[PDB]
Amino acid sequence: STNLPRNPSMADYEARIFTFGTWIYSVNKEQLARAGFYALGEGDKVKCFHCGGGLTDWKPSEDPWEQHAKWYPGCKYLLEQKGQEYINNIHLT
Ligand SMILES: [Zn+2]
């Protein structure tokens, strides 16, 4: 299902934040890991443990939850943590 994570090995926040040990980019690693992302080890590429959606080319001080909702609104981890109202608002500008 979409209710199960694509990468269960990254389902723990502690595991995700660990992948950002070598993170030099201007996007907050705690916010990234909170939003479900872990680092792939190539540039600023990250992937969501649940939906598998990848993001790259981050702008400085960008909001990871906003980008998660912008590009991958069907993610069930995004839904659980942020709710449908938030996802809809992101797409209403
Ligand atoms: Zn996701």
Residue numbers in the entry: 253 to 345
Give passages from the manuscript.
To further characterize the binding of 142D6 with XIAP, we solved the X-ray structure of the complex between the agent and the BIR3 domain of XIAP. A data set with a resolution of 1.75 Å was obtained from crystals derived by protein covalently modified by 142D6. Globally, the XIAP-BIR3/142D6 resembled other previous XIAP-BIR3 structures in both secondary and tertiary structures. Closer inspection of both monomers in the asymmetric unit revealed continuous Fo – Fc density with XIAP Lys 299 within the BIR3 domain. Prior to and after refinement, this density was an exact fit for 142D6. This placed the 142D6 adduct within the P1–P4 binding sites of XIAP-BIR3, a placement that was driven by several of electrostatic and hydrophobic interactions as highlighted in Figure 4B,C. In particular, within the P1 site, 142D6’s methyl group points in a pocket formed by Leu307 and Trp310. The N-methyl-l-alanine of 142D6 forms a hydrogen bond network with the sidechains of Glu314, Gln319, and Trp323, which span across the P1 and P3 interfaces. Engagement with the P2 site is observed to be primarily driven by a β sheet like hydrogen bonding network that pairs up the carbonyl and amine of 142D6’s l-cyclohexyl glycine with the corresponding main-chain amine of Leu307 and carbonyl Thr308. Interactions between 142D6 and residues surrounding P4 occur via a hydrogen bond with Gly306 and the amine from 1-aminoindane of 142D6 with the sidechain of this moiety inserting itself into a pocket formed by the sidechains of Lys297 and Leu292 along with a portion of the main chain in XIAP-BIR3. Apart from the covalent interaction formed between the 142D6 sulfate and Lys 299, the orientation of the sulfamate is also stabilized by a hydrogen bond with the carbonyl of Gly304.
We have recently reported on the use of aryl-fluorosulfates in designing water- and plasma-stable agents that covalently target Lys, Tyr, or His residues in the BIR3 domain of the inhibitor of the apoptosis protein (IAP) family. Using a variety of biophysical and structure-based approaches, we designed and tested several Lys-covalent agents based on the tetrapeptide of sequence Ala-Val-Pro-Phe (AVPF) that interacted with various members of the IAP family, including X-linked IAP (XIAP), cellular inhibitor of apoptosis protein 1 (cIAP1), and cellular inhibitor of apoptosis protein 2 (cIAP2).44−47 Reversible AVPF mimetics were developed as potential therapeutic agents,48−66 including the clinical candidate LCL16167−71. We recently reported on compound 142D6 as a potent aryl-fluorosulfate-based Lys-covalent pan-IAP agent. The agent was designed to juxtapose more directly an aryl-fluorosulfate with a Lys residue within the binding pocket of the BIR3 domain of XIAP.
